[PDB]
Symmetry: C6
C-alpha cells in the first residue's frame, strides 16, 4: 500500500504477510458471503492496483467468480476509456502519462507509475478507482451465490422469532436489497412470512412498530 | 483510526488485520454477552466513522441485531439533526462543512471529511459521537438477548454460593441493572434467592454485610 | 496506555488487541490463581484508569469477584476522598481540576483529564494509584477462591517430596502467607506435614537446613 | 529486503520470521497450485537476491521442482551474460562492478554488492531481475504439475454449473492459458464441455453471453 | 525493559504480551530442562529488576523451585550487602542512592530508581546483576530436577548409537558437567557405557577420535 | 542482533520472542533436514555471537549434534588463532582489543565487546565469522544424519517419476553433492536408477535432455 510514514510523506510499503494471509483465509472460510466485501475493502486500505491484483490473484478456488470479476473490471475499464481518452504518441520526458483503464487495473502500469499517480499533488487515485470497480464486481458475485430468495424465508412453527429474523435479514443482505427495502420490510414481508402465532401478535401491534418492538412482541 | 505518529501530529492509519479479526472473533465466540461492548469500545479506540462501519459490516451473523442497530443509529442521527441543523446550499470553497447525522454515521461523509473534522482545532469528534450512538444500540441488543430474568436466578440446594452469585451478577449485568441496584441487591434479592441453609446464615449476619462477608459466610 | 514515543514525549496509545486478548485469556484459563495478579500488573503497564476499566470490563465470567472488586475500589476511593478533599465550585478556566476517588477509578473522569494528570509535571499518577486499589481487591479475591488450608496439605505415603512441596507452597501463595512465613515454614509446618519416612530424614538434618537441602534429603 | 525507513533512505532489513514462515507454509499447503506464484511475488516484495535464495532454499520438499528451477535460472543467467558481458580484470578501487548472471542470482555476489546495485542512482534492480527469472521458472513448474487437461473437464450430469466452471477455470489457470483464451472459451469449449441440459440452455442464449449470463442461465 | 529508541537514548519500555506469554509457555512445556535457562536469559534481554520479578511471578506451578530460587537470591543479596554496604541516613536531595541487595532484586526499589541506576553514566547494571543471581538459582534447580545420573545412561543392545549419545549428553547437560568434562568423556565414560558391539568398534579406533568419528564408526 | 535504526546508525536490538520461537520450532519439526540450515542463517540475520549462542543453546534435544558442533567450532577457533594471534598483556586504555577464536564464538567476549567489533569502522564482523563456523558444523551434522545413500534411491515399478526425482534430489541434497554433481546426474545416475519403462523412454531421448524434458517424457 501507500502510507504516511512517522514524518508525514506518502510512501509505498510492502503488503504484509498478515494482510495476505487474512484475505486468503477469509475467502477460504466465508466464500462470498456479503461480509467478505467490507473485509476486502478494509484489508486493502491504501492499496495500489498492484496490491489489489495480488490479493485477487492469491485466491486459489472460486475461479468462476474470478473470471466473472475480470469481465466486470474489463467493462469498467472500457467505460473509463470512453470518458478519459489518453493522447497517443510519446510521453513528455520525465513527465507523468495519463492512466488508461488497464493502467488503473494494474495490468499495463508499473508500480512506479501507480505510485506516481497516487502521490501526485493532487492525487490521481488509481487504487481507489480500481477498488470501486472490484467491489462492483464482488457485489455481483455475492448476489449470484446468494442461495435463497427472500420469498422462501418463512418462520418455522417452533422457530424462535429471533432466529427467523436473522435468516431473513441475512438473505436480504446477500440478495442485496437497498437499505429502503430493509427498513421497509419490517412493516410487510417480515410480518407475512412470520408463523401464525407471531403473525397475529404482530398484526395486532399496529403500524410503525420498530424491529425491536416486533422482536420483543414475539419473544 | 486516527493516531499520533512518533512526532505528535494526528494522522489516519489503516485499521489493522489484527483489529479486524479480533472484533469478528469476539462476536463469533460471545455474541451479545455484555462484555462484548467494552471490547468493541477498546477495539475501536481512535476509530473514524468509516472504521466503525467497517467493524459493524464485517459481522456475518446476527443480522436482526444489525438491523435493530441501524434503527437506533437512525434515531440518534435524526436527533442530532434536530439539535444541529446545517446550512443548505454551496460550501465555502476550501472550507469545512458542518456534519449532519448521516455524516457522523459515515454513510454520507468521506474519509477525508471525517479526518478533517476529527483533526480540526478544536476537533469535531465524529468518531466519538458515532461510537456513543453505536454503543447505545448495542446495549439495547445486549438487554434484548439476555435470556433470563433476575427473578429466576435462585441458588440450587447443592449449588455452591459462589456459583450462584456468579449467575446472579452475570444476569443483572445483561438485564442492565444500574450500579445502584447492583450495590443494593446484596442486602435483598441476593439473600431472598439464596437457598434455605445459606439464607439463614445470611439473615443472621445482619444488615450492612459486604458481598465478601456474605460469600465467606456461605462458603 | 501512556508511553514515550521514539522522541521522548509522553503520549496516549490505544490499548492493543494483543493486550486485550492476553488478559481475557489469562482469566479464562487461570481464574484467580495468584499468578494472575502479576500478569494483570504487567499487562497494564502504563495504563490509564480507562484502560484498567477496559481490562476489568472485558471479563465475561466471574461476576461475583467483579462485584467484590467494585466494593473494594469504592472503599479505597472513599478513603482517597477522606485524605484529599477537592474544592467544590467552578474550575479555573483552562486549568487542571483535582482528582476525586471516582476520578482515579475512571468513572467520573474523561480520558483527557486522565492524560492531563498522568503527564503533568510532576505527574499525578492516577493510573498507578488505581492499579494499587485494583490489585488490593484482586488479592482479596485470590484469598477467597484459594480452595485449601495449608493445614490440609500433607505429603502422601508415595508422593514424591518435590510434588508435596509444590502443593505446599502453591497453597501458601493463594492463602497469602507473608514472605516471613514462607521462609519460616521450611523449619516447621513443612516438616510436620511431611510423610513418616521423609519426616524422620528431615528431623535428623537438624535446624537451619535450606529448602534445597530438605529436598535433596528426601529425594 | 531493501525498504525505505521512516525518513525516506533505502536500507536493508532482515527478512522476518513471519515472511520466512509464510512462504514455507504456503508451499507445504498448496505445492505448485498457480496461486502460489503471486503469493511468492508478494512475500518477496523488496527482496535482495540473497532473500530470494533464502526463500527458495528454505523449501524442504519438492526437490525435483527446485532442480528444474535452477536449470531455468541458469538458462536466464546465461542469456543475461550474452546481452551484458562484463569487463574482465581488476575493479576500479572503491567502485561498483557490473553484475553477471550469477551475481543477479546471488550465488557469486555478496549482500553488500547486491545492496550497492539496488540502491545505486539509478538502481540496478538485481532483485527484480532475479525475481522475474524465478517466476518464469515457477510458471514452468505450475504447468508441469497441472494434473488435468482442459479437454477432460466436463460437467457431470448432476454437477452444478458453478462447480463445473470453477473446475474449468481452475484447470485453465494451471495449464496457463492466456487471458485471451480465458475470455474466449466462454463462447466455446465451456459450452461444449457442459452437460446436455445446460448445453441446450446455453446454445439457446446466443453468442456474446457474459459468463455471468451463462451461470445465471444454468443456475 | 530498557531499550534504545530510534534516536539512541535509553528508555523504559513495557514488557510485551509476547514476551510474557513466551516465558510462561516455555515453563509450562519444558519445566526445568536446561534449555529453559538460555531462553530465560534471552527473553529478559534489557530487563529491569521489576521485569525479572514479573517473569518469575507469572509462573503458576513449580512453587518449590520458586521458593528455592528466593533462597538463592537472598543469599546473593546478602553477599552483595557484605561487599557494598550503603550509607545509612537521609539521601542527598535529588541525588541517586546506592543500591542494596534487595534493591537489586527489585523488592525495595522502585521502577524509577531502577531506571536511574541502569541509565546512569556509567550504568549501575542492576538488571544484569540480578539476572546473574537468578540464573545461578535456576541452575541449582536444573541440577536438582535432573532425573538421571550419567552413570545410568548406557547404550541399549538395539539402541542406535546416535540415540544413546543424545541421551548421554542430554543427561550431562542437566547434571551440569563442565565443558572440560563434556569434551573429555568422548574418550571415556561414553565408550564404557556403549553396548558390546559398539564398544569394540570404538576401542579399536584408538585415542583422539572426534565425536563425529565415533558416531560414524558405530553407525 | 545489530540493526540500523530508522535514522541509519548501527545499534543492538534484543533478539525477539518470534525469532527465538521460530528457531526452536524448526529444529523440533525438521531436525537436521538440509533446509534447516538456510532457515538458521536467515533467522540469525544480523546476529551477534551472543545471539548465535542463544539460538544454539535454546535447542533442547539433539545433544550429540550440539556436542559435535562445539567440536567443529573449537577446530575453527583454533585455526583462527593460528592465523590471527593477539598481543598478550594489558589493553591500551579505552581501546578495542583484538578478537581471539573464543571471542568470536562468544564464550570469552562480552556483548559490549562484540558490539564494538561489529560496529567499528570498518567492522570486524565477528557475528558473520562465527556464523560461518556454525554453518560449517551444521553441514557436517546434516550429512551425518542423512539416512540414505543416493545409490539406494531407485524408482519403484509403480512410483510416479516425479515422486522418484523428489526422493533422488532430496537425498543428494542431504548427502551434500556439489551443484556440479546435481546438474550432472540428470544424464547418469538419475537415468540408471529409473524403472525399466521410464529408463527406456529416457535412454531414447538422447543426451542433453533437461530435467524438465526427462520429467515430461516419463509423465
Ligand atoms: O491478473 C490479473 C489481475 C486482475 C484479476 C486477477 C484475479 C481475479 C480477478 C482479476 C485482472 C482484471 C481484468 C483482466 O482482464 C485481467 C486480470 N488479470
Ligand atoms: O453500512 C451501513 C453502516 C451502518 C451499519 C452497518 C452494519 C450494522 C449496523 C449499522 C448503518 C447505520 C444506519 C443506517 O441507516 C445504515 C447503515 N449502513
Ligand atoms: O465500569 C466500572 C469500572 C470499575 C469495574 C469494572 C469491572 C469490574 C470491576 C470494576 C468500577 C469500580 C467501582 C464501581 O463502583 C463501579 C465500577 N464500574
Ligand atoms: O542455492 C542456490 C540458490 C538458487 C536456488 C536455490 C533453491 C532452489 C532453486 C534455486 C540457485 C539457482 C541456480 C543455481 O545453479 C544454483 C542455485 N543454488
Ligand atoms: O516477589 C518476589 C520477587 C522475587 C521472586 C519471585 C518469584 C520467584 C522467585 C523470586 C523474590 C526474591 C527473593 C525474595 O526473598 C522474595 C521475592 N519475592
Ligand atoms: O555455550 C556454548 C556456546 C557454543 C554452543 C552452544 C550450543 C551448541 C553448540 C555450541 C559453544 C561452542 C564451542 C564450545 O567449546 C563451547 C560452547 N558453549
Amino acid at each position: 500500500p501507500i502510507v504516511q510514514n512517522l514524518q508525514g510523506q506518502m510512501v509505498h510499503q510492502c503488503i504484509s504477510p498478515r494482510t495476505l494471509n487474512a484475505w486468503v483465509k477469509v475467502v477460504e472460510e466465508k466464500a462470498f458471503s456479503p461480509e467478505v466485501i467490507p473485509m476486502f475493502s478494509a484489508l486493502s486500505c491504501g492499496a495500489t492496483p498492484q496490491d489489489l491484483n495480488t490479493m485477487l490473484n492469491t485466491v486459489g478456488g472460486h475461479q468462476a467468480a474470478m473470471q466473472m470479476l475480470k469481465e466486470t473490471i474489463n467493462e469498467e475499464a472500457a467505460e473509463w476509456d470512453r470518458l478519459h481518452p489518453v493522447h497517443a504518441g510519446p510521453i513528455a520526458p520525465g513527465q507523468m502519462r495519463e492512466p488508461r483503464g488497464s493502467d488503473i487495473a494494474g495490468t499495463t502500469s508499473t508500480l512506479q507509475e501507480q505510485i506516481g499517480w497516487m502521490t501526485h499533488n493532487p492525487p490521481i487515485p488509481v487504487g481507489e478507482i480500481y477498488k470501486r470497480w472490484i467491489i462492483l464486481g464482488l457485489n455481483k458475485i455475492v448476489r449470484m451465490y446468494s442461495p435463497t430468495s427472500i420469498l422462501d424465508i418463512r418462520q418455522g412453527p417452533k422457530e424462535p422469532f429471533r432466529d427467523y429474523v436473522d435468516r431473513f435479514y441475512k438473505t436480504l443482505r446477500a440478495e442485496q436489497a437497498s437499505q429502503e427495502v430493509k427498513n421497509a420490510a419490517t412493516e410487510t414481508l417480515l410480518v407475512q412470512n412470520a408463523n401464525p402465532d407471531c403473525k397475529t401478535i404482530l398484526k395486532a401491534l399496529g403500524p410503525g412498530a420498530t424491529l425491536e418492538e416486533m422482536m420483543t412482541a414475539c419473544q
